[PDB]
C-alpha cells in the first residue's frame, strides 16, 4: 500500500513487534503520522527505556541496578518465587497473595529447542538461598514448566530447602462441563477437606 | 502490574494508540525493553516521520511538499477520486483499477457530530478541476459517506463535470445466503446485462 519512506520505515518497524500484523502496522503508522504530539511522546518514552535493564539479583526489569521488589525493605525474604518471565512475576505480584522475593529465569527447560540450565538465568538462584525458608516453584503449568519444576526441586532438595508448587485445579468462576479432563482430574486428586 | 517509571511511561504511551488495550501495551513494552536494538530502530523511525505531512494538493501523506501520486507524471489527470481518508486512498490504489488523481477529505459529513464542509478539506477540491473529465465520488458506502457523495454531486454538477459512484453490490467470493438484505437488494437493482 504505502510509498513515503519514513512512513514505510515506521510501518516496517511496527511489524517487527510480536502479535502485530501488517494491517495493524499500517493503521498505527498512519495514526502516528497524523498525531505528531503523540508520536514525539512515544519516541521520548522509547529513548526513556534505554536505561532499563535486568536486575542484578532477580532478572526482573529495573531502573538502574536493583528492581523495585529487591530494594523494598518490607519484603518477606524467607520466601522466594522462581518464575519463567517478568510477565509472570507481574501476574503473581498483581494476585496480592505473595510478599516474597522472585528469581526470574530466561524461560523454561526444553530439550526439543536445546534450552537447558546454561541458557536460563539458573546458577544465580543458588547464590541467594541465605535465610530462605521456602522456594515457590512458580513456573508455568505446562510440560516445559513442569520439567523445569522437577529439576529445580531435585537441585533445591539437595541443597537443604523445602519447595512448593502452586495448585493445579479449576479456575475461579469455572464450570466442570467446559473444563478439560486433565485439569478436572488433577482438581479431584488434589481435593482438600472443608 | 508495572512499577519502573520508563517502562510505565512506555506502556502508557503505547495505550494511547487506537485498538491497543493495556494488556497488549504491557506485552509490547516488555518486549521493547528486552530488545534494545529493535526499540532504537522504532525511535529512529518515529523521529523519521516528523518530516511527513499532508500533501499541498491531495491531503495524502507526503515526504515534504507533494505526495508520490501527485508528482508521478504517468497519471491520468482527467480522472479524480474523492476519498475520506489516506487508508481509503491506499486501498483504492492497491486495487490497481485506477490511475487518476485523488482528493483526500478529513472524513465525512455528519450533522450528529457537527462535521460539515468547513471541517473537511473540501474547498481545495474545486480549485483542481482544470482538465478533469471525471470525478469519482469514492467516499464510504455508509449513511455518512452517501450524504457526502450527494453533496459533492450537487456541488460538482453545478460546476460542470460528470460524477460517478463506485458500485454497491455483492463482494467477490460472496454467497447470497449470508449477504444482508439491503446489499443484496442493491445488487439486484444495479444488475447489468451479460
Ligand atoms: Cl493484521
Ligand atoms: Cl488488551
Ligand atoms: Zn530484583
Ligand atoms: Zn497529493
From Swiss-Prot, chains A, B:
The processes (GO biological process) annotated in the record are: DNA recombination; DNA repair
The C4-type zinc-finger regions cover 55-70
Q: Which Gene3D superfamilies match?
A: 3.30.60.80, 3.40.1360.10, 6.10.250.240, RecR Domain 1
List, alphabetically, the SMART domains matched: HhH1, TOPRIM
Please list every transmembrane segment annotated in the UniProt record, as residue ranges: none
Provide the Toprim domain boundaries.
Answer: 78-171
The UniProt GO MF terms for this protein read: DNA binding; zinc ion binding
Cystines in this chain: none
List keywords of the entry alphabetically: DNA damage, DNA recombination, DNA repair, Metal-binding, Zinc, Zinc-finger
Q: Does the UniProt entry include the keyword Ribosomal protein?
A: no
Report the sequence similarity comment from the record. Answer: Belongs to the RecR family.
Protein's job: May play a role in DNA repair. It seems to be involved in an RecBC-independent recombinational process of DNA repair. It may act with RecF and RecO.
Query: Which PANTHER family does this one have?
Result: RECOMBINATION PROTEIN RECR
What is the name listed in the Swiss-Prot or TrEMBL entry for this protein?
A: Recombination protein RecR
Q: Which gene encodes it?
A: recR
